Design goal:
Chain D: Keywords: Methylation, Ribonucleoprotein, Ribosomal protein, RNA-binding, rRNA-binding, tRNA-binding. The structure is cut from a larger assembly and holds 2 copies of chain A, 1 copy of chain B (185 residues), 1 copy of chain D (122 residues) and 1 copy of chain E (60 residues). Chain A is α+β, with helices and mostly antiparallel strands and 66 residues long. Helix content of chain A is 24%, strand content 17%. Chain A contains 2 helices and 2 strands; from the N terminus they run E-E-H-H. Chain A has a two-stranded antiparallel ribbon with strand order 1-2. Chain D has one domain: OB fold (Dihydrolipoamide Acetyltransferase, E2P). Chain E has one domain: Ribosomal Protein S14/S29 (30s Ribosomal Protein S14, Chain N, Irregular). Chain E contains 2 helices and no strands. Chain E is elongated. The relative contact order of chain E is 0.13. Chains in contact: A-B, A-C, B-C, B-D. At the A-B interface, helix 1 of A face loops of B. The structure holds magnesium ion (MG) (31 copies) and zinc ion. One magnesium ion binds next to loops of chain E. The structure holds 2 RNA strands.
RNA sequence: UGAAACUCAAAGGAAUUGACGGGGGCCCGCACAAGCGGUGGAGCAUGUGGUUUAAUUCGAAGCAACGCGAAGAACCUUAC
RNA sequence: AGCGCCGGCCAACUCCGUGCCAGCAGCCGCGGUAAUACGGAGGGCGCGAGCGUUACCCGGAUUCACUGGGCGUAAAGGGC
């Protein structure tokens, strides 16, 4: 989740199980559809909702212009 | 006949009754993340009814939802009317070669009959086991007699049968124990 | 292609007064209609229902990176 | 029967059996659905008609019919029911009125709108 | 192949064994009589019609 | 003595005209019989079924479809 | 200026879409590629600031029959 440009916010239990909540930019949120299957053996889930705006680092900034 | 081949025959005979249990436990609306619960269902493929395990691919990605991956989009409408079939009370989306089924949190009216269903399939498995064991002792009654075998021998053959029988019982108890905690979870 | 373009603009018109969250606006430069939305599932059912209730001679990309400056 | 007989016993009056028990003396009754279903009818009709089992505020839980094309009803949906049977759907003694509570009208009705809860077009 | 085959039958082909009689009022490739050029159906249509000279119903 | 819930759009009465009868009566047709030569069995001719096949074109289905539409398929005919 | 209807009862007809599907239905019943019966349109009938629906009472029900019904075979003569 962090190598997906993630900034964690905390974790909590649920079905025991446990829930984890973070902030991830949409661009790095495509493979994550089926990636939770590759990891959790098909036992995880998610929801994903938009939040806000920010300023991408100049590593991806100055390279998106092409 | 003989002993080792009677045990292998027994352990084999009891396995089939055990796997039959697992079949009966998946095909229930469990925690409802199960894929095989929807894998067997009466449909309508070209007039004739047939099991959809020769029609589509059930796969359970996330637990809360489930997909019934199909390969015939005129059968998905035959499946969709066959999912909307009296039972599960579920509202599936369809098409785009897709067929999604989200699962509501099991209510205490259905959670009530789920456990009750599990333990029922549980006991019947054990009775399948125990009825096989008695078949095995009768296989032993003749086999000891037929072969002019010792007494203290034919005693341990009984205990060795019990050892075997308490094998398939503990697993059967453990199967329906887990499947419950997924319903209570 | 090509003469059934006016059913597209009339298809999503039945969904504008029925679902007022997503938008349909053509691109100035590059020039093309972009069907906005809220998510993949939101813009999968619009793509599905149109292809199977409204025929719509169409096939799309499509990413969704929709940046702003 | 003799005039005398009629004095003794008397002409037995005929009783009107109500045709809608769950309604319980009301014109309408609110309820909540337990199943969303499609049930095939008897001979010689073949289809899959939209039927929703509803547990009413009268304590009752009967089988209700969803008229028109396209419904949004699901489990936990709140709905209002009226009278009305179906000659070829046994057990179904009641109709669900479109356009009330969680039950929404049919889209793009033109004829006979007020029966299907469809506002006037623009 | 109905209108293209009766027109094929008007054009003299490449070799003479391919010569087949085609009816001259309906277009049959079988039961076509060279004495009438029609076919056994258009024979009976016109026999009763009398327009076949002399051709009358036989009964002996 | 004798309910109901539920469920059906009929359950019935007689009579009429048909058809049917392992019902009757009086008849006829190579229908049986009485006769005579055949088929099935053999080898081939010809048509279908099936499979085969790039195609083995389509139709005809108990009688009343099977030397039938074809009273002339090497090519043509010929639709595959 | 809206609502209901426009298969028979029962007043008011065609077109297209659909193909025992989607749906209508108060009864008998409609939809299996020419649907006056389904959905829309054009057209028509009926009412009007109302129109349709559900629930109930009575009517038609002479179908609890005093007015004004029956009981051989239809439901019904009591075993005597
Ligand atoms: Mg000892
Ligand atoms: Mg307006
Ligand atoms: Mg022609
Ligand atoms: Mg030509
Ligand atoms: Mg001839
Ligand atoms: Mg008679
Ligand atoms: Mg008679
Ligand atoms: Mg006779
Ligand atoms: Mg022969
Ligand atoms: Mg053939
Ligand atoms: Mg045919
Ligand atoms: Mg004959
Ligand atoms: Mg009216
Ligand atoms: Mg009329
Ligand atoms: Mg009229
Ligand atoms: Mg006319
Ligand atoms: Mg249309
Ligand atoms: Mg109507
Ligand atoms: Mg009838
Ligand atoms: Mg039509
Ligand atoms: Mg009508
Ligand atoms: Mg109409
Ligand atoms: Mg009344
Ligand atoms: Mg009157
Ligand atoms: Mg009157
Ligand atoms: Mg009266
Ligand atoms: Mg009467
Ligand atoms: Mg009287
Ligand atoms: Mg009477
Ligand atoms: Mg009687
Ligand atoms: Mg007595
Ligand atoms: Zn001719």
């Amino acid at each position: 989740l962090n190598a997906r440009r993630g900034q964690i916010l905390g974790m909590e239990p649920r079905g025991n199980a446990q829930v984890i909540r973070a902030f991830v930019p949409l661009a790095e949120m495509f493979g994550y559809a089926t990636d939770l299957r590759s990891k959790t053996q098909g036992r995880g889930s998610f929801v994903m909702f938009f939040d806000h705006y920010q300023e991408v680092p100049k590593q991806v900034q100055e390279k998106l212009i092409k | 006949m003989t002993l080792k081949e009677l045990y292998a025959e027994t352990r084999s005979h009891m396995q089939k009754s055990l796997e039959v249990l697992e079949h009966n436990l998946a095909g229930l609306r469990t925690g409802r993340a199960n894929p095989a619960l929807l894998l067997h269902l009466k449909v309508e493929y070209y007039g004739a009814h047939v099991p959809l395990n020769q029609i589509a691919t059930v796969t359970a990605p996330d637990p809360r939802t489930l997909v019934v991956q199909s390969w015939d989009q005129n059968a998905l409408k035959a499946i969709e009317k066959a999912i909307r079939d009296s039972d599960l009370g579920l509202n599936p989306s369809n098409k785009g070669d897709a067929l999604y089924i989200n699962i509501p949190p099991l209510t205490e009216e259905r959670r009530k009959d789920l456990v009750r269903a599990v333990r029922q399939y549980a006991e019947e498995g054990r009775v399948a086991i125990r009825n096989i064991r008695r078949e095995a002792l009768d296989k032993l009654k003749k086999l000891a007699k037929e072969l002019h075998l010792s007494e203290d021998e034919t005693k341990r053959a009984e205990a060795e049968i019990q050892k075997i029988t308490d094998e398939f019982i503990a697993k059967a108890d453990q199967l329906a124990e887990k499947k419950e905690q997924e319903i209570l979870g | 292609t090509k003469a059934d373009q006016e059913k597209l603009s009339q298809a999503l018109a039945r969904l504008a007064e029925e679902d007022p969250t997503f938008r349909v606006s053509t691109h100035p430069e590059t020039g093309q209609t972009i069907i906005s939305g809220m998510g993949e599932l939101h813009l999968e059912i619009i793509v599905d229902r149109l292809k199977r209730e409204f025929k719509v001679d169409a096939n799309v990309g499509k990413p969704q990176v929709a940046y702003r400056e | 029967p003799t005039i005398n007989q009629l004095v003794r016993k008397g002409r037995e009056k005929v009783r009107k059996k109500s045709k809608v028990p769950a309604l319980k003396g009301a014109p309408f009754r609110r309820g909540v659905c337990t199943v969303v279903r499609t049930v095939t009818p008897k001979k010689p009709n073949s289809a899959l008609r939209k039927v929703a089992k509803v547990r009413l505020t009268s304590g009752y839980e009967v089988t209700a019919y969803i008229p028109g094309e396209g419904h949004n009803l699901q489990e936990h949906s709140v709905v209002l029911i009226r009278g009305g049977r179906v000659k070829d759907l046994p057990g179904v003694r009641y109709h669900i009125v479109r356009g009330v509570y969680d039950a929404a009208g049919v889209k793009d009705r033109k004829k006979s709108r007020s029966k299907y809860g469809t506002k006037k077009p623009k | 192949a109905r209108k293209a085959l009766i027109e094929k039958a008007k054009r003299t082909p490449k070799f003479k064994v391919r010569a087949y009689t085609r009816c001259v009022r309906c277009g049959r490739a079988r039961s076509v009589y060279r004495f009438f050029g029609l076919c056994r159906i258009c024979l009976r249509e016109l026999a009763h019609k009398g327009q076949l000279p002399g051709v009358r119903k036989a009964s002996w």
